[PDB]
Amino acid sequence: QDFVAWLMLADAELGMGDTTAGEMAVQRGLALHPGHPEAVARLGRVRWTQQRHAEAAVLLQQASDAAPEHPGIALWLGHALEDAGQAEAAAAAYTRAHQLLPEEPYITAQLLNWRRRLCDWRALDVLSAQVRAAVAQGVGAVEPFAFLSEDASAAEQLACARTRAQAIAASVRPLAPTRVRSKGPLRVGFVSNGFGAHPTGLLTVALFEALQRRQPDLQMHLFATSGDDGSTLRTRLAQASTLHDVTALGHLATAKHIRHHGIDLLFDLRGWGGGGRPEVFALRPAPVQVNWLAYPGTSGAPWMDYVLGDAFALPPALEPFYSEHVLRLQGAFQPSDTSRVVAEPPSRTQCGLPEQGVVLCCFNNSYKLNPQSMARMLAVLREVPDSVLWLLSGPGEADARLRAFAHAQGVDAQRLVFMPKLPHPQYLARYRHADLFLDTHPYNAHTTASDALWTGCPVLTTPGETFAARVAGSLNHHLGLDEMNVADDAAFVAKAVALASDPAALTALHARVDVLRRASGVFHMDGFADDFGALLQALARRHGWLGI
Numbered sequence: 001q002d003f004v005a006w007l008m009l010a011d012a013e014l015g016m017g018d019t020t021a022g023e024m025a026v027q028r029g030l031a032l033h034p035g036h037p038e039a040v041a042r043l044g045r046v047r048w049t050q051q052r053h054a055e056a057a058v059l060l061q062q063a064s065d066a067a068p069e070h071p072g073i074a075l076w077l078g079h080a081l082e083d084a085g086q087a088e089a090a091a092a093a094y095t096r097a098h099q100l101l102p103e104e105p106y107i108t109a110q111l112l113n114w115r116r117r118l119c120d121w122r123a124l125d126v127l128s129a130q131v132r133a134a135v136a137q138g139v140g141a142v143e144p145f146a147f148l149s150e151d152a153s154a155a156e157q158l159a160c161a162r163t164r165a166q167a168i169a170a171s172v173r174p175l176a177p178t179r180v181r182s183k184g185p186l187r188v189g190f191v192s193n194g195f196g197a198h199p200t201g202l203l204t205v206a207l208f209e210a211l212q213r214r215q216p217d218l219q220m221h222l223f224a225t226s227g228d229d230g231s232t233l234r235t236r237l238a239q240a241s242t243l244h245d246v247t248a249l250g251h252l253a254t255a256k257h258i259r260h261h262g263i264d265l266l267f268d269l270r271g272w273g274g275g276g277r278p279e280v281f282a283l284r285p286a287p288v289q290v291n292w293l294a295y296p297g298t299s300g301a302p303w304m305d306y307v308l309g310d311a312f313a314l315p316p317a318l319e320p321f322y323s324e325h326v327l328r329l330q331g332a333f334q335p336s337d338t339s340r341v342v343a344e345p346p347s348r349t350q351c352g353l354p355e356q357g358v359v360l361c362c363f364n365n366s367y368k369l370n371p372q373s374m375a376r377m378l379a380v381l382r383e384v385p386d387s388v389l390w391l392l393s394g395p396g397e398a399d400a401r402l403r404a405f406a407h408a409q410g411v412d413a414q415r416l417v418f419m420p421k422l423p424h425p426q427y428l429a430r431y432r433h434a435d436l437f438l439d440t441h442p443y444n445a446h447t448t449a450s451d452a453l454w455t456g457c458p459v460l461t462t463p464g465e466t467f468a469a470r471v472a473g474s475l476n477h478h479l480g481l482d483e484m485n486v487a488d489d490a491a492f493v494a495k496a497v498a499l500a501s502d503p504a505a506l507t508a509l510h511a512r513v514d515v516l517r518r519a520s521g522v523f524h525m526d527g528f529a530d531d532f533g534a535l536l537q538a539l540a541r542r543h544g545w546l547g548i
């Protein structure tokens, strides 16, 4: 007959992963004091872990109303609103929560991440500062993936990453160590939530296909942390490897499953950004663990032996900012699905383009569209009379905010065009109307840059000082397109303008993109598989492998 105790014990089930016996406890808490903000909020947290995202928000909105000053409620409400797909309302609650506890960094950082997603730039500079300070001070549980959006050095990214990795490591007891097998075929494993219609699957599929044909001595094992999505990608990946569906397994069981298969080299294709699975790596189920492709920066993690980069994206000057030992592929670090035949799109009109005019384009998640990147794109529009800027439609009112900024920047708002979300092949097809792709800084197009070039659309970029800001530049460089890697904003604006105001030169550059996309190594997955396989083998011998 004890109220406080019920919620306290309901919390103990949560914490230990007890949705069902935890709900019995919360419900009985509500049967003593019905409508009490502390229980009403808690019931909404149940529904939320049970994945009843919409009922959660209805309940958490009650509490919030019953106590608009309770910061924990304000915050919990926001998560539910977010996970219920209500972007704008979600950012309002974090805005309130931040205002209730102006100096709680944990909240500031989630606030910042949501504003960037909605292209809401109010007091952006102050929030960015507060997040970076929090990284400095070790506080805030800033997430390394979110941090990539900030203009922060490689030194700051390492701080963020390694603090985060160290907190996780302190809560985890690694599996007993093991060594790379001495003899026999190498077992190489990759952990990922994106084996299907997602960037990781999309980038790695033709590569796994080539490895299957060309590197018979390496056994590729995919550990998929997501179920089968019906995509040809997922099916092709399963056909080109041994795919283990470990969706549903906890961290410990996933790590145990990897160990069960005696994986020699384990690759994190998550990496710091997915649902996670970070403790799966903290458990050290494989003797050599490699950060590659998925997370574009250092893991900062004591459980990660290596990072796999390339000479341009991960140049020598950048090595000290990586906790891992750095390995490099001979060409670009990024593979791609060179089996794609880009289809033909609907007419320009049907894609919301004017029938005439240069179409500048930047397809990229909203959080990469920062003021600096937008402003240099708007500058090109201002200098080139009939051009247009093509963007992906973003969440909530992001599109309207960009429109207003275009106006504020002296550009007719209607010269922005927003592509709705489209299955991959239809989206890829859109590039055939694109004249020039304008990269963002400091977080480049990554998968979208690969898409553009594969279709034949040039990418203009300003290689920066962190790996995430040199990816597009690495593709350009390995393709041979160095004139498309330029020094700074002024040079980026001047280059996009020289090209857009001269349609013959722009056409010549499309023809040059086409020759180089045929000739260069960037899009030869046979040679990528050879180089990848040889690296894997050399790395395994360095750890005792005596070969097949």
Ligand SMILES: CC(=O)N[C@@H]1[C@@H](O)[C@H](O)[C@@H](CO)O[C@@H]1CP(=O)(O)OP(=O)(O)OC[C@H]1O[C@@H](n2ccc(=O)[nH]c2=O)[C@H](O)[C@@H]1O
Residues within 6 Å of the ligand: 194, 198, 199, 200, 202, 203, 270, 273, 274, 293, 294, 295, 363, 364, 365, 392, 420, 421, 422, 423, 424, 425, 427, 428, 445, 446, 447, 448, 451
């Ligand atoms: C792989 C990589 O280099 N970067 C990581 C990726 O590995 C990771 O798993 C993901 C998790 O956050 O973060 C970035 C993705 P990143 O590489 O940044 O790729 P994004 O720009 O997020 O691209 C999303 C994907 O959706 C496709 N698209 C987009 C819009 C549309 O309407 N239709 C469509 O098909 C694009 O081809 C792209 O492949």
Ligand SMILES: [Mn+2]
Residues within 6 Å of the ligand: 244, 257, 261
């Ligand atoms: Mn298995």
